[PDB]
Design a protein around this motif. Structure first.
Motif, mmCIF file in Angstrom:
data_model
loop_
_atom_site.group_PDB
_atom_site.id
_atom_site.type_symbol
_atom_site.label_atom_id
_atom_site.label_comp_id
_atom_site.label_asym_id
_atom_site.label_seq_id
_atom_site.Cartn_x
_atom_site.Cartn_y
_atom_site.Cartn_z
ATOM 1 N N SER A 177 0.828 -1.219 0.000
ATOM 2 C CA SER A 177 0.000 0.000 0.000
ATOM 3 C C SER A 177 0.848 1.249 0.000
ATOM 4 O O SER A 177 1.970 1.242 0.444
ATOM 5 N N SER A 178 0.262 2.357 -0.463
ATOM 6 C CA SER A 178 0.918 3.656 -0.568
ATOM 7 C C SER A 178 -0.124 4.736 -0.512
ATOM 8 O O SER A 178 -1.153 4.638 -1.199
ATOM 9 N N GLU A 179 0.124 5.714 0.340
ATOM 10 C CA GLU A 179 -0.720 6.870 0.462
ATOM 11 C C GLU A 179 0.122 8.133 0.269
ATOM 12 O O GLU A 179 1.171 8.307 0.890
ATOM 13 N N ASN A 180 -0.367 9.007 -0.604
ATOM 14 C CA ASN A 180 0.186 10.357 -0.819
ATOM 15 C C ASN A 180 1.520 10.378 -1.516
ATOM 16 O O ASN A 180 2.210 11.385 -1.474
ATOM 17 N N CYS B 31 3.874 10.926 3.274
ATOM 18 C CA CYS B 31 3.491 9.734 2.522
ATOM 19 C C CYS B 31 3.785 8.500 3.352
ATOM 20 O O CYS B 31 4.800 8.490 4.037
ATOM 21 N N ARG C 114 4.060 4.270 3.096
ATOM 22 C CA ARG C 114 4.180 3.099 2.219
ATOM 23 C C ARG C 114 4.353 1.885 3.097
ATOM 24 O O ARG C 114 5.121 1.913 4.081
#
Ligand SMILES: CCCCCCCCCCCCCC(=O)O
Ligand SMILES: Nc1nc2ccc(F)cc2s1
Length: 130
Positions: free
Chosen positions: A11-14, A123, A125
């Motif tokens: 998963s990864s955000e931003n 971010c 990850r």
């Protein structure tokens, strides 16, 4: 240690906003945004190696904790990097042109959690063992 292994991005955000804050151009952001790299972490005495492998780009760093080293990043920045261990977290700072970004790698339950900060952007990850 807790870090040694072969880790796969789950998963990864931003991450797009993070790359944009670093100055990464659109074509490279497009390539990074849906990459699902593996991260292979190994240690031999004083020396830690982190390999990042993906279909379109591989990179590698080897370092000694607390000793600055020159790094070419995946987006072709030439930076001065320093990595230390602080309360079990591997803390990396990259410095270039009077700027800095931090990448913190921590082990949480089953996960390798990577927090990347540039200015106001954070971010996250997450990797799990391959
Ligand atoms: C070809 C894809 C290039 C994508 C460029 C990414 C910019 C470099 C920032 C990488 C931050 C490290 C994150 C991590 O280890 O999960
Ligand atoms: N060698 C590589 N490093 C990264 C870092 C981030 C990413 F999204 C893709 C790649 S490929």
């Amino acid at each position: 240690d807790a870090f040694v292994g072969t880790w796969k991005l789950v998963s990864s955000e931003n991450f797009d906003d993070y790359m944009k804050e670093l100055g990464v151009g659109f074509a490279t952001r497009k390539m990074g945004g849906m990459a699902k790299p593996n991260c292979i972490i190994s240690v031999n005495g004083d020396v830690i190696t982190i390999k990042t492998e993906s279909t379109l780009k591989n990179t590698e760093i080897s370092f000694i904790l607390g000793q600055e080293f020159d790094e070419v990043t995946a987006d072709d920045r030439k930076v001065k990097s320093t990595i230390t261990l602080d309360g079990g977290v591997l803390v990396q700072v990259q410095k270039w042109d009077g700027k800095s970004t931090t990448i913190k790698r921590k082990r949480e339950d089953d996960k390798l959690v990577v927090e990347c900060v540039m200015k106001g952007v954070t971010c996250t990850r997450v990797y799990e063992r391959a």
